[PDB]
């Protein structure tokens, strides 16, 4: 005969079964399979068969799964295009994921990334004036532009950079349609819409590339990271690495800490605003801690309690990803149900961190139950999964998590926030692979004191 089927989840009849659903309503599809199948249930995404885990047992064997098991490598199709068949330093698979965000990881560079950012906010907000009004996520992706930039790259970069880098950068998240599991390349307005955007970005670093080479003036010094890559010559003399190649490089290191870290801050505040006592507790806490003439340099990289308990919170109702994916390379049995070789197999932290034993009233916002006697976040080791878990944990956590402390320990000191539209308008666009927040998202903002 053949294999028996897995549970599968009700619905899936549109052109490419569940796919569209997945595009309106990833969540809620996601929750009906855990509702409907179990720890173990799956939806049709096109061609692709993905057995959705849940639950503490499931996701430890998808988090603790080694590459050669569930390969993570090709599990998301959507960023090829977006990365780019560019080659800057030629190296194994693991090595180039390493070289991306390694570097600029380190603990001894976050003293100095928290002052970078600290700078990034200040020059955001220096023309806020009195009061007035902003958008989240058009204020948070750019400021995340500038951080990520400044951070990763340099400082001399992020410089010469403007609102038109990050105009293009959203576009190229935009271009992450979940159709990208059909093929990445399909004749779609939001595919197309990404390759001129990812155009557009080689165009403006070919444009910084050139008034470098023509007027290099200054100190002779602050060359940054493009200075180094414009000045690789090739064994001819020729340069080595076009605008292209550099371009699809920059792009590569700021992806992952860009959507995540812009979406974060947004809802990191829209939590403050919804729960005025929490935002109260924060301010408190800041406004004493700051109270040692310390700098957010040195702040930024120590206990702030009551902000990273509502980040966390943050983080376990809105996680940046939703769905985590994984393509399997052989066979394995979990609880009963056998996954294939070819299957992809996915864990979702939007799901997993609202399982309602592992986390009492999940839908609430409690910050408390990360507080040393709770601390919720610690004991349910493989279903609160903000940063996923186990080998391929996000090794950007500690970045991530420093930077929401930077960002509000300006922000929440310099003015007071109110929202501008109802509480329950603020709301994530999940069309697309890469989740944003939806707009409108506005926020009222003034002077302290
Ligand atoms: C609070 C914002 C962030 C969240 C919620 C987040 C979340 C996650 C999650 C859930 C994963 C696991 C993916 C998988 O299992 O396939 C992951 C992986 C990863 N993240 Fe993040 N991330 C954030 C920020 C960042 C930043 C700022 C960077 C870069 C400095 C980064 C770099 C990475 C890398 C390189 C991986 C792959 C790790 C591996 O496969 O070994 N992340 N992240
Ligand atoms: C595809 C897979 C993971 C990511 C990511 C990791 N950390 C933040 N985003 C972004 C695109």
């Not at 989840?9 to 490419?16: C, F, K, L, R, Y």
């Not at 190229?172 to 004749?187: C, F, I, K, N, W």
Request: charged fraction near 25%; include cysteine; glycine fraction near 8%.
């Amino acid at each position: 005969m053949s294999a028996v089927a897995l549970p599968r989840v009700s619905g899936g009849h549109d052109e490419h079964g569940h796919l569209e659903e997945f595009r309106t309503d990833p969540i809620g599809l996601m929750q009906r399979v855990r509702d409907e199948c179990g720890d173990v249930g799956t939806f049709q995404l096109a061609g692709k068969q993905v057995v959705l885990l849940s639950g503490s047992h499931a996701n430890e064997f998808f988090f603790r799964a080694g590459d050669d098991d569930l390969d993570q490598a090709k599990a998301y199709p959507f960023m090829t295009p977006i990365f780019g068949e560019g080659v800057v330093f030629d190296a194994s698979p693991e090595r180039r994921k390493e070289m991306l965000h390694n570097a600029a990881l380190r603990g001894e560079q976050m003293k100095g990334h928290a002052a970078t950012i600290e700078d990034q906010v200040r020059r955001m907000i220096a023309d806020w004036g009195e009061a007035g009004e902003i958008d989240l996520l058009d204020f948070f992706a750019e400021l995340t532009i500038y951080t990520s930039s400044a951070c990763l790259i340099g400082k001399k970069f992020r410089d010469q950079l403007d609102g038109r880098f990050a105009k293009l950068y959203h576009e190229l998240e935009r271009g992450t349609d979940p159709l990208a599991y059909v093929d990445p390349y399909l004749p779609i307005e939001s595919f197309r819409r990404r390759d001129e955007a990812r155009n557009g970005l080689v165009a403006l670093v070919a444009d910084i590339m050139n008034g470098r080479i023509a007027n290099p003036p200054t100190d002779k010094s602050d060359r940054d990271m493009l200075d180094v890559l414009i000045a690789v010559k090739a064994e001819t003399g020729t340069p080595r690495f076009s605008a292209d190649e550099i371009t699809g490089m920059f792009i590569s290191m700021m992806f992952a800490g860009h959507h995540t870290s812009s979406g974060t801050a947004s809802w990191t505040l829209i939590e403050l605003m919804r729960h005025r006592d929490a935002y109260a507790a924060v301010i408190d806490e800041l406004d004493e801690l700051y109270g040692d003439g310390r700098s957010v340099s040195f702040h930024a990289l120590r206990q702030i309690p009551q902000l990273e308990n509502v980040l966390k919170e943050t983080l376990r109702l809105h996680p940046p990803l939703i769905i985590l994916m994984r393509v399997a390379k052989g066979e394995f049995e979990v609880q009963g149900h056998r996954i294939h070789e070819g299957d992809l197999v996915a864990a979702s932290p939007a799901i997993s961190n609202r399982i309602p034993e592992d986390f009492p009233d999940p839908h609430d916002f409690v910050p408390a139950r990360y507080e040393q006697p709770r601390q919720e976040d610690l004991l349910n080791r493989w279903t609160w999964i903000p940063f996923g878990a186990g080998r391929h944990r996000c090794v950007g956590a500690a970045f991530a998590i420093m930077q929401i402390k930077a960002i509000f320990s300006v922000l929440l000191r310099e003015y007071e926030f109110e929202m501008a539209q109802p509480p329950e308008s603020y709301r994530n666009d999940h069309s697309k692979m890469v989740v944003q927040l939806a707009q409108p998202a506005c926020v009222r903002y003034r002077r302290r004191t």
